[PDB]
Amino acid sequence: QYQVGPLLGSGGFGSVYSGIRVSDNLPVAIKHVEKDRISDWGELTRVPMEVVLLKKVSSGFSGVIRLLDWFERPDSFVLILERPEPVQDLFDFITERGALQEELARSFFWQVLEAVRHCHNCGVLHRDIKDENILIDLNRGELKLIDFGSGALLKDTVYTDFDGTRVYSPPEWIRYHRYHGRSAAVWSLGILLYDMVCGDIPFEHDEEIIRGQVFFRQRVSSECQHLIRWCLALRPSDRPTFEEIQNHPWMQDVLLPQETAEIHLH
Numbered sequence: 293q294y295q296v297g298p299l300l301g302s303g304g305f306g307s308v309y310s311g312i313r314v315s316d317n318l319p320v321a322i323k324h325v326e327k328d329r330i331s332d333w334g335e336l337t338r339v340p341m342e343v344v345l346l347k348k349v350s351s352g353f354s355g356v357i358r359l360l361d362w363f364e365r366p367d368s369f370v371l372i373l374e375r376p377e378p379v380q381d382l383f384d385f386i387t388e389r390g391a392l393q394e395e396l397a398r399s400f401f402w403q404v405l406e407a408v409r410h411c412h413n414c415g416v417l418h419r420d421i422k423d424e425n426i427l428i429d430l431n432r433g434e435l436k437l438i439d440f441g442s443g444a445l446l447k448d449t450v451y452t453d454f455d456g457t458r459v460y461s462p463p464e465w466i467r468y469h470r471y472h473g474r475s476a477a478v479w480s481l482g483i484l485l486y487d488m489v490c491g492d493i494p495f496e497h498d499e500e501i502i503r504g505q506v507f508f509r510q511r512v513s514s515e516c517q518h519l520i521r522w523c524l525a526l527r528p529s530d531r532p533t534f535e536e537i538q539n540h541p542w543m544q545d546v547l548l549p550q551e552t553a554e555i556h557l558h
């Protein structure tokens with residue numbers, strides 16, 4: 293069914309290969325994870341939570357990489373995922389080009405917010421929003437979220453477990469091992485937005501997270517700084533809702549994805 297190409301990446305999520313579907317030559321990504329390396333399991337019949345979450349968000353179109361198929365092997369699960377070409381993750385894009393111009397960051401950040409709101413509307417909490425989990429479709433200027441392997445069903449009660457990226461995790465997690473879904477998502481989005489406009493993350497150590505004082509090392513507009521510090525409020529209830537982020541003055545007059553690729557990516 294699939295012709296396997298080069299390894300695209302490996303890590304906590306397993307090993308992802310480029311691939312082609314033999315029937316129609318569709319580009320795909322093929323991701324393998326060992327059963328013993330999976331901790332979180334759910335039901336559709338017993339599968340990794342990742343599969344449950346991906347099925348919940350893979351309906352229709354969105355800024356989420358769609359699950360096409362999956363296989364169970366004796367000791368592993370294989371996922372067949374959509375693959376845009378050419379593509380680059382946002383971590384590589386930022387490493388390569390440095391801090392993003394605000395117009396470009398606005399466009400990218402907006403698409404991330406739309407993608408995250410889609411997950412939430414589908415009852416899915418990502419829990420690992422970061423540059424490495426965002427793919428850029430370089431020709432269409434469209435961003436796509438990947439790696440639901442630390443995710444959970446969205447709920448309104450407290451989470452007491454976390455296995456995403458610590459430097460994107462909120463202070464209430466660091467201090468108390470307790471967070472709520474959406475306000476922890478908004479914290480990670482503040483980290484992400486800082487990362488886009490400054491070219492690196494604002495905090496490296498637990499004590500920096502807990503203090504929550506943001507220093508801007510690059511020239512960033514007042515409205516962008518304001519949105520960032522809002523998302524990064526120490527008290528979860530002081531953070532903006534998704535609607536408040538998208539109504540923020542910094543977020544107005546966003547470029548279309550194709551405009552974005554034409555101005556910034558070609």
Ligand SMILES: NCCCNc1nc(-c2ccccc2O)nc2ccccc12
Pocket residue numbers: 300301302305308320321323357373374375376379381424425427438439440441
């Ligand atoms: N940090 C990026 C990892 C390597 N690249 C890629 N990684 C993943 C991927 C990585 C971890 C978990 C789920 C996933 O779908 N999916 C991709 C889908 C299409 C193209 C590339 C992909």
Ligand SMILES: [Ca+2]
Pocket residue numbers: 508509510511512513
């Ligand atoms: Ca500045």
Ligand SMILES: [Cl-]
Pocket residue numbers: 305306307324325326329
């Ligand atoms: Cl693995």
Ligand SMILES: [Cl-]
Pocket residue numbers: 454455456457458461
């Ligand atoms: Cl942690």
